[PDB]
Structure 1
């Protein structure tokens, strides 16, 4: 037998027993969106993989306030294959809405295929430089997560956050220094990106490097200040 421990952030649990893992509740029982493990305690939990995805790499690193709650609507930018998007949908439950944006068609097919069975995911196949194109589909959102590996991540987050994000909402960005200068220490690039977000309007709250899960990756969490 195993025990389910409620994690600090809502909608996230930890399996306890002979082996310990990070888990989320399953929206569609009896199905796995990819090759992750399922634990039945009844209620079924899918197992997060922090090496595979970067959001609960930040959770395992101990982010303070994730801005992702079961009530909230989340705008996911850079949603390749929907693997992390399924768990974000599990966190926001049936009430919350996750708008998952992806440009490339090859993860686009499987993002559509997973959003077929997951109701609360609204898939968007559209380039993230241009928020005005999918403005019909989005309302206001509580948080914006970014996983794009682009040089102008700060500009993309600026354009999307000015247009869709509410006041006092949250921005959670994953930054890799290799898609930036990459010939200096990664701390320098991270400081540059934090300064860019401050210029844009996002007031940063915290920064967390993702060792041992990713190399030269950080999660920067901040709050949007429209004023």
Structure 2
């Protein structure tokens, strides 16, 4: 598809900080915080703009669930430039870098991960991106790393755990702003594989509702991913 010889046209996406590369093939794209290097081997689009040479990173949706949400057409993304953003289940910088891209230098990204091995690649990537604050800790006890986190306008959790909802529940109570953002990616197989997906996705919605989270939208991620979806809701403390 996209090749060094090919020329592409970059235009803005409906979401601030998300960009589209037209041409032969229509790419989901973000500005690079650290130009000249690819975090997970993603291809890079470099453009002349008045002339400064701005550099971009391709966002592969098959690799990042959030990007799969973009192409599926999420109505609202609380993740945007100039916002504090808290990320749970941070295996590596495959998606954090792109989230670090959209927030921009002004924003910050709080990355949380539990396993020692995936974390070491995350901290290596955090060195290139000053706006990422890496947290090697279990999300089941947000009290441990309350030390290191301010507020967060939006919490988006990719923890593939049966107890994912509570992990969101506790973190949102600790840090999330009132009327703040909540974006949950769900994989029904982990929490309950026995029952069909549709009943599973309904079940979690009530749990978020029980935790004063008002769900706004949800999106299943085929053809990229099976038995998955992203749920979007707002934190109504009152």
TM range (shorter): over 0.9
Of 26, 31, 36, 1:25 maps to 31
Give the distance between the partners of 2:191 and 2:119, measured in 1 at CA.
Answer: 26
1-structure distance, mates of 2:108, 2:35: 19
CA shift digits 1:182-219 (9 cap, x unpaired): 12210100000001100011100011110011100010
Any conservation in 2 of the 1:154–1:200 contact (CA below 8 Å)? no
Look up the SS of the partner of 2:101 in the other structure.
helix
Corresponding residue pairs, total: 227
Query: Equivalents in 2 of 1:208, 1:134: separation in Å?
Result: 30
- Distance in 1 of aligned mates of 2:29 and 2:184: 22
Residues 11 and 90 of structure 1 are in contact (CA less than 8 Å); yes or no, is this contact kept in structure 2? Answer: yes
| Counterpart-to-counterpart distance in 1, 2:32 and 2:192 | 40
C-alpha deviation, 1:158, in angstroms = 0.4
Tell me the TM-score normalised to structure 2 length: 0.94
Does the aligned pair in 2 maintain the 1:143–1:165 contact within 8 Å?
yes
Mind listing any 5+ residue stretches in structure 2 that lack a counterpart? Answer: 1-6, 48-52
Q: Distance in 1 between matches of 2:216 and 2:94?
A: 27
TM superposition outliers: structure 1 runs of 4+ over 2 Å? none
Which ranges in structure 1 are unaligned for 5 or more consecutive residues? none
Q: CA RMSD in A?
A: 0.7
The two structures have a TM-score, normalised by structure 1, of: 0.99
Displacement of 1:19 in angstroms is 2.2
Distance of 1:193 and 1:128 partners within structure 2? 18
CA distance in 2, matches of 1:135, 1:83: 25
Q: Measure how far apart 1:24 and its partner are.
A: 0.3
